Structures are given as structure tokens and as C-alpha cells.
Amino acid sequence: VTYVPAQEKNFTTAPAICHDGKAHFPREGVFVSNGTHWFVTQRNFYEPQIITTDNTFVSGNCDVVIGIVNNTVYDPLQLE
Amino acid sequence: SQSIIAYTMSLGAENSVAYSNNSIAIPTNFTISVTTEIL
Amino acid sequence: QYTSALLAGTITSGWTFGAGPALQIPFPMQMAYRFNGIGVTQNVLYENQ
Numbered sequence: 566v567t568y569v570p571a572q573e574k575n576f577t578t579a580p581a582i583c584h585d586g587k588a589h590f591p592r593e594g595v596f597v598s599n600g601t602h603w604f605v606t607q608r609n610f611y612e613p614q615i616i617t618t619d620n621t622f623v624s625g626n627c628d629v630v631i632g633i634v635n636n637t638v639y640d641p642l643q644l645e
Numbered sequence: 646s647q648s649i650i651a652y653t654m655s656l657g658a659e660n661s662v663a664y665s666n667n668s669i670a671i672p673t674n675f676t677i678s679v680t681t682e683i684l
Numbered sequence: 685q686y687t688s689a690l691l692a693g694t695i696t697s698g699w700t701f702g703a704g705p706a707l708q709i710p711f712p713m714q715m716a717y718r719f720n721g722i723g724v725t726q727n728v729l730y731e732n733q
């Protein structure tokens with residue numbers, strides 16, 4: 566008994582998402598975009614999610630990553 | 646209307662991929678297939 | 685020709701052309717995945733590409 570994916574869909578990717586002077590690589594899953602806003606989703610299914618500070622781990626300088634894309638990450642600590 | 650013909654083999658269906666610097670293809674559905682194997 | 689097909693399936697779609705349909709992916713990201721498989725994070729590759 567096996568599992569087989571189906572029904573693919575083209576998207577747009579980016580290695581990282583640069584917030585204020587940092588890199589913010591994802592923890593698990595790609596960084597995909599619809600055509601407007603960026604989301605983080607799994608690798609074998611399509612479950613988009615908002616880019617919150619618990620889905621991404623941050624380490625960098627926003628200078629050495631080739632192909633980085635500008636977007637804002639969210640955090641549940643500033644609100645509360 | 647029936648006869649025997651000779652042809653060269655076809656290795657498979659002709660297909661090409663669409664590689665690019667920024668493009669992903671993420672499935673949004675699956676299937677379950679049950680194969681068999683005899684030994 | 686078979687060898688070329690197997691080789692060209694590896695560099696544009698990673699290992700996804702083995703299980704089912706072939707899904708495109710950039711080579712730096714595929715290498716980041718393979719590095720993640722070893723047990724080292726992606727940032728090391730993205731800093732020393």
C-alpha cells in the first residue's frame with residue numbers, strides 16, 4: 566500500500582525572507598507566494614500559513630543569501 | 646486487415662520539464678494505490 | 685539515452701520524479717534539502733554556496 570501525490574500547481578519561491586537586518590530561514594517547508602503575499606507551507610501538501618516567528622528560525626545578515634526577498638514576519642509577543 | 650509489422654522500440658512518452666530560478670510545484674491532492682509482488 | 689533521462693530527472697526535480705509526478709525545484713534549494721538530510725541546517729549552505 567503506497568502513497569502518491571497528484572494535482573501539482575506552479576508557484577514562486579525564495580530561499581529566505583529578510584526582515585530588519587536578518588535572514589529568517591524557514592524551519593520546515595518552502596517559502597511560497599500566491600502572487601502577492603508570502604506563506605510557509607509543507608513540502609508534499611499545500612497548507613499555507615502566515616509567516617510567524619515560530620515557523621521560522623533566524624540567523625544571518627541579509628547580505629550573503631542570494632535570491633532573498635523582502636517581506637515582513639510576524640510575532641505573537643509584540644501584540645501581547 | 647490483420648498482419649505482422651516491425652517497428653523500433655519507443656523508450657517512453659516524450660516529456661520535458663520547466664526548470665527556472667524560482668518556481669515550485671506543490672501537490673494539493675493524493676491517491677492510494679495497492680500494487681502486488683510475487684516471489 | 686536512458687542514462688541521460690535518469691541524469692536530467694535528478695537536476696531539475698530532485699527526487700520527486702521517483703515517487704510520482706515530477707515537480708520542478710531550483711538546484712540551490714535541492715542542495716539545501718540534501719544538506720538538511722545529513723543533519724546540518726540550510727544556513728550553512730546559504731552562507732557558503
Ligand SMILES: *[C@@H]1O[C@H](CO)[C@@H](O[C@@H]2O[C@H](CO)[C@@H](O)[C@H](O)[C@H]2NC(C)=O)[C@H](O)[C@H]1NC(C)=O
Pocket residue numbers: 584585635
Ligand atoms: C529590501 O529591504 C531593505 C531594508 O528593509 C532595503 O535596504 C535599503 O537599501 C537602501 C540602499 O542602501 C537604503 O537607502 C535604504 O535605507 C534601505 N532600507 C532600509 C529600510 O533601511 C532594500 O533596498 C530592499 N530591497 C528592495 C529590492 O526593495
Ligand SMILES: *[C@@H]1O[C@H](CO)[C@@H](O[C@@H]2O[C@H](CO)[C@@H](O)[C@H](O)[C@@H]2O)[C@H](O)[C@H]1NC(C)=O
Pocket residue numbers: 599600601602
Ligand atoms: C494571495 O493570497 C490571498 C490570501 O490572503 C488571496 O487574497 C484574496 O483577497 C480577496 C480580497 O482581495 C479575498 O476576498 C480572498 O478571500 C483572498 O483572501 C489572493 O487571492 C492570493 N493571490 C492570488 C494571486 O491568488
Ligand SMILES: *[C@@H]1O[C@H](CO)[C@@H](O[C@@H]2O[C@H](CO)[C@@H](O)[C@H](O)[C@@H]2O)[C@H](O)[C@H]1NC(C)=O
Pocket residue numbers: 673674675676
Ligand atoms: C482528490 O482526488 C480524489 C479522487 O482521486 C477526489 O475525490 C473525488 O471526489 C468526487 C466528488 O467531488 C467523487 O465523485 C469521486 O469519485 C472522488 O471520490 C477529491 O475530490 C480530490 N481532492 C480535491 C481537493 O480535489
Ligand SMILES: *[C@@H]1O[C@H](CO)[C@@H](O)[C@H](O)[C@H]1NC(C)=O
Pocket residue numbers: 573574575663670
Ligand atoms: C508550470 O509552467 C510550465 C510552463 O509551460 C508548464 O509547462 C507546467 O505544466 C506548469 N506546471 C503545472 C501546471 O503544474
Ligand SMILES: *[C@@H]1O[C@H](CO)[C@@H](O)[C@H](O)[C@H]1NC(C)=O
Pocket residue numbers: 664665666
Ligand atoms: C537565472 O538567473 C541567471 C543569472 O545570470 C539568468 O541568466 C537566467 O536567465 C535566469 N533563469 C531564467 C529561466 O531566466
